[PDB]
Symmetry: D2
Subunit: 506 residues, 4 copies
């Protein structure tokens, strides 16, 4: 993607694209005025020998002590070095890229007092596909990960280029840069903010959306496999409840299923025995999940565009004000909200798998295999789905309700947004595995309705899976089939079946 960025206007679709693939960006000309004007306000404070906390002061004893020039340049470097105190595995380059772009976006709104040259150095790194090392853990909601990113600007730390670690000076040279020296306010502008928290949660959102889309297709396949009814999806039921998420979800099921299929007609008014809730309550459960993800997306899409550093520079009035926008509470809650959605998408899918395995409910052979007292079929795949779904219950415990006071009680309440967002990634792996197993089971069950077809889009879902995984004719090593179905889901194989304009970023 090639982006001429109007700061503060990134959409969720643009954020998904940044998360998914490399970007080339530059600032729109309209960004220059406010960026340069907050720098000029900082420069005027210094030229006028005024003292402003977080501009030309120290910290602590010196918090309203105007320290001298000399000390102030070095102070920026000391802040980045000492604050780069994170730990844990390195983030992958896609996430590092997203964090860098979010930081560029926020700074480029012109309230932070950082030189346009420093912003353009971050842009050069993005454009060169040079990604600073950022460790996963340490932020309480994002001094440490943002300090690690910023090290490379100073010629410290390391960065990844074409999958290999480079020294910061080699990495800068790849991007056409040499090490920079920071000025007043720039250490705080780079280190204070919510961009790591927000990126972690946005990744969770995009995963939740991918899983929602796949679950509409998988659930439609499972309805067909067990001769379920389309009547639960009737628009009038959903209008009468009035829940938007459910209305839009039922509309997606109707789009994928259509009014009837060869399978449904071949079993006619089938419906003589009411469907289980894991089928018939899909609009209600998946709709609640959709509302939850939309809740979270609204908060996260704002936060991606937020001015989140401190103190803020209001050049139009000539004011520098210390507030609290670095506190990532809304991000932490958005991530905890997303956990409910990822968990319940998986729970409902796991119950549909269980239904398909139950001969009294599925109208299929037990465990979806012919010769069933000699073959186990899908029996243990169903157990794997149970294990994955169960893990998500404990993982749903909220992080936004915890806090510890850091630094002699001044940092006396924090968000825990990073932990909240990061756990969504593993929840999403769990739900993706459940859905992969459901996909496998429903395609197997439809195969056993010999020669019959489902709807146009659900046949595309069958064809996608059968390109890699064969019908289960007799017991064979099961796990490679699950692995392949998971990889197809992770690559977005089913996402394009969902109607446009339903999910926040799609």
């Amino acid at each position: 993607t090639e982006l001429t960025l109007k700061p503060g206007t990134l959409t969720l679709a643009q954020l998904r694209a940044i998360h998914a693939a490399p970007v080339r960006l530059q600032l729109d000309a309209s960004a220059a005025p406010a960026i340069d004007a907050s720098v000029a306000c900082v420069e005027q404070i210094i030229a006028e020998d005024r003292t402003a906390y977080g501009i030309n002061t120290g910290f602590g004893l010196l918090a309203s002590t105007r320290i001298a020039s000399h000390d102030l340049e070095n102070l920026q470097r000391s802040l980045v070095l000492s604050h780069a105190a994170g730990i844990g595995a390195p983030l992958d380059d896609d996430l590092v890229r997203l964090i860098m772009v979010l930081k560029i976006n926020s700074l480029s709104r012109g309230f932070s007092g950082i030189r346009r040259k420093v912003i353009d150095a971050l842009i050069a790194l993005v454009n060169a596909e040079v990604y600073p090392h950022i460790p996963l853990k340490g932020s309480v909601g994002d001094l440490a990960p943002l300090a690690h990113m910023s090290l490379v600007l100073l010629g410290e730390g390391k960065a990844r280029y074409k999958g290999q670690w480079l020294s910061a000076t080699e990495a800068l040279a790849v991007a056409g840069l040499e090490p920079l020296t920071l000025a007043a306010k720039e250490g705080l502008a780079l280190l204070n903010g919510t961009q790591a928290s927000t990126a972690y949660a946005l990744r969770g959102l995009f995963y939740a959306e991918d899983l929602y889309a796949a679950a509409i297709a998988c659930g439609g396949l499972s309805v067909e496999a067990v001769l379920g009814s389309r009547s639960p999806f009737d628009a009038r039921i959903h209008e009468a409840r009035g829940q938007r998420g459910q209305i839009d979800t039922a509309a997606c099921f109707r789009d994928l299923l259509g009014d009837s299929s060869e399978v449904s007609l071949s079993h006619k008014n089938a419906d003589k025995v009411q469907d289980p809730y894991s089928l018939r309550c899909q609009p209600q459960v998946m709709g609640a999940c959709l509302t939850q993800l939309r809740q979270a997306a609204e908060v996260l899409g704002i936060e991606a565009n937020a001015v989140s550093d401190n103190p803020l520079v209001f050049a139009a009035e000539g004011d520098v004000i210390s507030g609290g926008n670095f506190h990532a509470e809304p991000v932490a809650m958005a991530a905890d909200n997303l956990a409910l959605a990822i968990a319940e998408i998986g729970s409902l899918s796991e119950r549909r798998i269980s239904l398909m395995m139950d001969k009294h409910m599925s109208q299929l052979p037990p465990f979806l295999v012919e010769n069933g007292g000699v073959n186990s079929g899908f029996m243990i795949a169903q157990v794997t789905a149970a294990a994955l779904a169960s893990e998500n219950k404990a993982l749903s415990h909220p992080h936004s309700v915890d806090s510890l006071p850091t630094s002699a009680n001044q940092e006396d309440h924090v968000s825990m947004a990073p932990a909240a967002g990061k756990r969504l990634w593993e929840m999403a792996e769990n739900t993706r595995g459940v859905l992969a197993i459901e996909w496998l089971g429903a395609c197997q069950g439809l195969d056993l309705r010999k020669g019959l077809k489902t709807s146009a889009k659900l046949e595309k879902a069958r064809q996608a899976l059968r390109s890699e995984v064969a019908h289960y004719d007799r017991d064979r090593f099961f796990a490679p089939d699950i692995e392949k179905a998971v990889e197809l889901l992770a690559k977005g194989s089913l996402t394009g079946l969902l109607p446009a304009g339903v999910l926040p970023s799609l």
Copy 2:
């Protein structure tokens, strides 16, 4: 309140009023057409000897077995009796009233096929202030509590009138009624639905709103008590982040605090040392809480108006359709969302109490008492606040992520909405106790700034507390002071200070 109900149009303010106090209601004339038309559709199915699941069938063996008249009347009674299988403490009358009104509202939209006479019998009970016994527990999201309510219509169960338990026949007579006999579809119309789940969560919402309002006033008092700054509330900071909850929250703080007060001016540019986050990040944390409660309120206000029984009768087309609107998933998630807000309101307040107790941070005597090596002052009240805030972490664990399959796997996924909503009530007691202690502490600390006043609305908060609880001059039995402050908060003493149009139902 006197209400001429247009079904499906209840507002959150009206729901708060129903929850708070008795009501007298009647249906608007415009409700009659659809109510009577879905009854006529049911009557036409029976007159035409057609068979329709959930109208004139049995269940199970007989699910598409048109059973005879005789059996069908008795079947309604057998359903109510057998389904009234709840357990636990009786609900209070305010909550029973809310459940009854929600059921009236939903049925009166005309999609359920229940006689207007049966709806008007529920209305007569409400109007007579006769409240069926409903036990707290048993629903998985609301057959059992709604069956208990419905017993009284049949002359079974018991009901409360002027605080005393009456037999159902005495209770009906108070309301001008005699026992009714139910018709086709009416047992399911009464028992299926989400009204208990929704009422439990609405009570949680109203509590969360009450606590939000009180926390703006308490936090403003604490800012003043410790000589905190107003600069964190500056509108430009909040506009620059762009989070609506935070913008509106900072506007509330500015309204209550004003630009300056005698206390703030008497300590002038005070601000020489940055405020702790529990003060300066109030817009960010309380704003995240406000967004969360607004999230939940949107879902709950829709659900209060929802058609939530099954099967639904679409008289305009002549269709009866079985779906899943009884599944309370969105309510369960809304309640889990509210838990985050109630917990974090309390956590932030508890940190402000801790700040006030800390002589290095408060600019007040340790533990808010004079003669402090002989007097303990607020030391153990602060511990009580810690205990209450801590309990809310475990209580925040979500219920919406659990389910058990009931009835031979047909009821194979449920919401757990009742448990999700009910736990909010105790969370709210915990946060109310924390805020009561904060109120006490900040008024004590302001008293120690001898003769100085805070802003107009915050002085009203001081006066409200000091009408019941004196300045703490020397150690005395502490707990009665906490009890009185809690009761004042529970009665809404501080709610009217908040600007109108901020909280969903206010």
Copy 3:
């Protein structure tokens, strides 16, 4: 019970008896030496004008400031008054009695420096059945509840006698007492300690034990009702695993079931189809629960006898030492351990109920009723059991992992033991309701095996229930049957069937 107490030697059976019913106690003569000797050590410090923290110092500025006599008497009173800062519902008298006896026991070990006269005043209150008001909440693990108890000794607060609240002076007079004045160290000896935390957790233990016992009988009934096998209980299986809890649990099942019964013989080698895990894995699951409760009981039985105040007086060496025995961490963990046991007893029972409702698994009519397309039978009782079991998952979240720093970070890590123990009470109500429903279902199912009997002890369980609740012949109001079964379980109706010497306190 009449007890001549050798301090520090209370057994779990004695603690159960104290919890269950009134007591009359006196100290054994052998207690006097150490009690009076630690008082004499305190008196010698004061006579020698020495200074000892927590004996004759203030707190804070004065922590190693020997304050004068005068101030020291008043200081004790100020501590009790200011520390009585709890909130919430009053504890019931049984729990208050247990707390008082635990405090008597701990102080009477002679390490606390409190006059024997003050200990004997607490004993007089117990013996007179006069129970101070103690509010439920406020301790973080037990200054506030122990301060509330202690108020009555000073003629403050209130106390319950024959179910009515009395002023402290009337309450003291009932016990033959007049208000006391405390001496050096006595305020801390009364207020510091773990007795409320320990009592809350002991109540949880006793409930868990009661539920374990009832669950062996209910599970044996359910095995019989569905024609399950006795082979899973064979001692050789359990010896081969080697887990003690499971060995002892299987021995209990064999004792209650016997080698065969009329029902089992009438269905002979029945066993042709393997039993579900909720039957066949009872030794494994219930055994894990038994080990967990034994874990907790070992810790709690020690803590009931612990010296838990501070500073401690070692009269034999002449030393007063400040440590940390008031920290209730081990109690908090014991309570969290008990939560796992209470939850899993309930989960396994709920699955046995579900099995009995499933015609494909139970060999009984669906929902345990004859005429089943017209009668719903136990269908909604099973839903109530699901709701109760589900609630226990969230309630199992541990409290021992939380802490907040109280009082300017000196009280910088606390246990949250009170919250951990108290939540067990509601978990136990939930599991008791599940077991009540299982009891009802299995007796109903056995009735449907017309004229057949189970084993001697399981017939006693049937007779106990059928004395209050009839066979379910046709749909009727269900809930009163659940209520009666719960009350029978709460009264210990099934406990006496379990072999002696299995459960810690039984």
Copy 4:
């Protein structure tokens, strides 16, 4: 380690050694009788044309259908292939080795009916250091991971040798083996069992023990750094409480600290101001943790030796019995117990870090650095410790309280032991990072007490860290210091300071 295994007698020290490093094992001669005798019992059933579930039956339709020879060999292979349905990252070789040895141990007790040749093939793989691929996820407590392990015996799947993946036939050849054909009962003997669950939890135990040991040394360093007292560790305090974990923990602190040190003497009766609980309540909190880990270790050490497959063969009586020993409930609870210990070790350490950063409490410069309004020192390392400690609260939510019914409700209650154990690994990473930061901080703080030494063993802890990480003289890139301290802890640098015979496996 070279082991002549007496089955069923492995100690926790031996299990630690197996987990830590390669092993060479053979069975003791005394193992042969029972192994061969249960095979002969299986052979006698087949020779006698008897039918025995799980020996010579099918499953399902055929569960008491004696299927023919032919089908029975192939049935073993079909079970392994179809059951190898796990997903997720491959286990590391140390854990695979532990699982293999636990399976060898359990089978070699002679109750499973599997040929000694098959056991010796697993032994050959261990001895050759050839480790089957086992994916992390899928078991609900261990068909799938044990099926994956077993694939390699049949010449399927893959195995790791010298860090590289080999085909199963190459891997077998490395071990001197060719593919095997399984006999009656052998597929179930290999696949049923608790060895993966038990290995996952044992790894958690060993980590918890390593962290306990490191935390005694780190906490002793922190006591010294802030001039804390040794009086809290006095044996008489701990004897008077009577909790064993606390007694043994205080004895460990006394051993490492000694009666006095140069630092403690140089500050003399220092003690004039009481230490915070994070120091003075170390015996109480760490002792509760020790009891918890000992609880868990007792259960896990039994389970490592358990006969956990099914059905079991009792050759002495000639009986084959189906029970439930594959249900890993006790392991799941042991793992949840360990979570409390790992969490609270980390919480207490994080509070000691916070104490060291607080100039009002530490008697050290703020943030442990000289020149502190220009240098940030340990400020953000402390934030990293807060983040890690906080994550452990949510991760402590129990898995043993969840279950889903798998396979048409026969598998109707499961343990979730694998998830319970696996999450301990990440909890341990979190607590290890906290302790690494504490180690760094306390060594820095002691350095600032110029030229003074602590005790003999605590100086060894200082020397170990200072071999890799220098004194923090001025701000520098912080994170590499944390990384090095974590690696030293992970390698057991501090474990050998703890007295022997305290921790279960040490």
